[PDB]
Amino acid sequence: VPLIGSLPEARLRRVVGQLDPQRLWSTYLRPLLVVRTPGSPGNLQVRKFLEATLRSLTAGWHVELDPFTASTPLGPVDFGNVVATLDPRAARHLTLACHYDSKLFPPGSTPFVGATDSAVPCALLLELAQALDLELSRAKKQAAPVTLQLLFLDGEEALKEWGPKDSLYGSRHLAQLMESIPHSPGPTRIQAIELFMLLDLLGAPNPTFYSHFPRTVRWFHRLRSIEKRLHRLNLLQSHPQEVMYFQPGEPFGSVEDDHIPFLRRGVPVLHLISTPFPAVWHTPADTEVNLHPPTVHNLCRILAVFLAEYLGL
Ligand SMILES: O=C1Nc2cccc(OC3CCOCC3)c2/C1=C/c1ccc2[nH]cnc2c1
Ligand SMILES: [Zn+2]
Numbered sequence: 383v384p385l386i387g388s389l390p391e392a393r394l395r396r397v398v399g400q401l402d403p404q405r406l407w408s409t410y411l412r413p414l415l416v417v418r419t420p421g422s423p424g425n426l427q428v429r430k431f432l433e434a435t436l437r438s439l440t441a442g443w444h445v446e447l448d449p450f451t452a453s454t455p456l457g458p459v460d461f462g463n464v465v466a467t468l469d470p471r472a473a474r475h476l477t478l479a480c481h482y483d484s485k486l487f488p489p490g491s492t493p494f495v496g497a498t499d500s501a502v503p504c505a506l507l508l509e510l511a512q513a514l515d516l517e518l519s520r521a522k523k524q525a526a527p528v529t530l531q532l533l534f535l536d537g538e539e540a541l542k543e544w545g546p547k548d549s550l551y552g553s554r555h556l557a558q559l560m561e562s563i564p565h566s567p568g569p570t571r572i573q574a575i576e577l578f579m580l581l582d583l584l585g586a587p588n589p590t591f592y593s594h595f596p597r598t599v600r601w602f603h604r605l606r607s608i609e610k611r612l613h614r615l616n617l618l619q620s621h622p623q624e625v626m627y628f629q630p631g632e633p634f635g636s637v638e639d640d641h642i643p644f645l646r647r648g649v650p651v652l653h654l655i656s657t658p659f660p661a662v663w664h665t666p667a668d669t670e671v672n673l674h675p676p677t678v679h680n681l682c683r684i685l686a687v688f689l690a691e692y693l694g695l
Contacts, residue, residue: 411505417493448463476529507581578649583655609627
């Protein structure tokens with residue numbers, strides 16, 4: 383049931399046991415469920431919550447901000463990404479990414495906080511850096527050569543409906559900055575990224591994922607192999623069938639998301655997005671109540687394992 387690189391079943395359980403669903407739901411998810419369109423008092427609130435939550439970690443994450451400003455239909459706008467790098471001097475790193483801005487809808491409609499789009503991912507990343515903190519802290523003390531980088535991207539969502547120059551403000555910029563910064567080896571910080579794992583649209587019930595990239599299908603398989611186990615170990619909730627989320631296959635082929643600026647620059651990209659989109663994207667019906675906490679806590683579990691098998695924690 384396990385491939386090569388896999389964890390031993392004893393660790394895995396020990397690991398899993400470090401996850402704390404109440405923290406996930408009540409510490410990191412519930413307070414992101416505000417409205418956080420770019421340059422909003424809430425888009426600010428969240429940005430600062432992220433910065434300070436991650437900085438509170440023992441492992442010593444080096445958390446920088448990527449503040450900038452860009453011309454957009456609603457005029458000039460003040461964006462700000464949150465780049466948290468566990469070990470900046472290490473040569474390459476796994477990058478988990480997701481955006482923390484909520485799309486902007488017209489005024490008056492019920493306010494849109496996009497539970498799945500993308501707070502549940504933002505929260506997952508947090509719980510993962512916390513659960514596995516001491517483990518990640520070890521690796522960093524023992525000079526591990528591949529570390530972990532958490533990107534919380536602002537300004538994914540258009541402001542006056544999609545378009546190349548009105549979309550992905552946050553990603554398009556950090557990929558621009560990252561390409562300017564030299565790195566040894568490298569030559570740029572863009573090559574630091576050994577793999578761009580992009581979470582988006584997670585937390586709706588009964589999702590389905592696929593390999594939109596054959597460059598990285600190796601890791602999707604693993605992601606699928608990590609599902610069952612856990613199913614075969616009675617460690618997933620509401621998981622009657624064995625493979626359910628990570629299905630086998632190939633295309634669509636692509637859907638436009640925060641990974642794009644980095645693929646132009648030749649980065650390996652695992653797009654980890656629900657295809658199809660939840661039945662609630664893009665409505666004011668994307669709210670804490672329409673999620674499926676089990677499905678959330680399994681994705682967290684799967685991811686947590688992956689992270690441990692990937693960085694050899
Ligand atoms: O922002 C948007 N408003 C729309 C309204 C109608 C259809 C749409 O999709 C078309 C257009 C581009 O995307 C795929 C088909 C969109 C849309 C795109 C989109 C895609 C993936 C995302 N992940 C997080 N926000 C996302 C937004
Ligand atoms: Zn969205």
